[PDB]
Amino acid sequence: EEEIREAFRVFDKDGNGYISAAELRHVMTNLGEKLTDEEVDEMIREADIDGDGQVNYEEFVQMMTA
Numbered sequence: 001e002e003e004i005r006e007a008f009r010v011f012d013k014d015g016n017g018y019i020s021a022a023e024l025r026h027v028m029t030n031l032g033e034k035l036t037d038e039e040v041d042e043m044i045r046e047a048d049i050d051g052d053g054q055v056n057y058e059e060f061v062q063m064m065t066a
């Protein structure tokens with residue numbers, strides 16, 4: 001799905017292949033959804049299968065399609 005690859009690029013602000021909690025928080029704020037660190041940390045932990053504290057593309061697709 002190409003829409004999913006685009007949405008990943010949107011969230012991965014610095015393009016380094018990982019969505020950090022700070023990127024996620026800033027994007028949600030751009031969308032008008034103001035979230036706390038505790039909140040975006042929890043969303044990340046739910047998707048973070050390899051436990052590195054970030055969401056890579058492999059993790060992102062699993063989350064978006066399961």
Ligand SMILES: CN1CCN(CCCN2c3ccccc3Sc3ccc(C(F)(F)F)cc32)CC1
Nearest residue numbers: 007027028029030031032033034035043063064
């Ligand atoms: C794709 N994305 C994933 C999950 N869902 C909704 C989750 C949050 N959501 C929400 C929560 C409670 C009641 C209504 C809505 S709709 C909505 C609209 C915009 C956003 C905004 F602006 F924050 F993105 C978030 C949401 C649909 C949107």
Ligand SMILES: CN1CCN(CCCN2c3ccccc3Sc3ccc(C(F)(F)F)cc32)CC1
Nearest residue numbers: 011019024043044047055059060063064065066
């Ligand atoms: C179940 N189905 C797929 C999953 N969810 C989205 C859950 C969290 N999600 C979210 C929630 C509210 C509004 C937008 C988004 S998009 C998004 C982007 C990255 C992550 C990150 F970085 F944490 F993975 C999690 C999310 C919506 C519907």
Ligand SMILES: O=C([O-])C(=O)[O-]
Nearest residue numbers: 033034035036037039
């Ligand atoms: O931002 C908040 O406080 C929330 O979503 O509960």
Ligand SMILES: [Ca+2]
Nearest residue numbers: 012014016018
């Ligand atoms: Ca990044």
Ligand SMILES: [Ca+2]
Nearest residue numbers: 048050052054
């Ligand atoms: Ca990870």
Ligand SMILES: [Cl-]
Nearest residue numbers: 035036037038
């Ligand atoms: Cl804070």
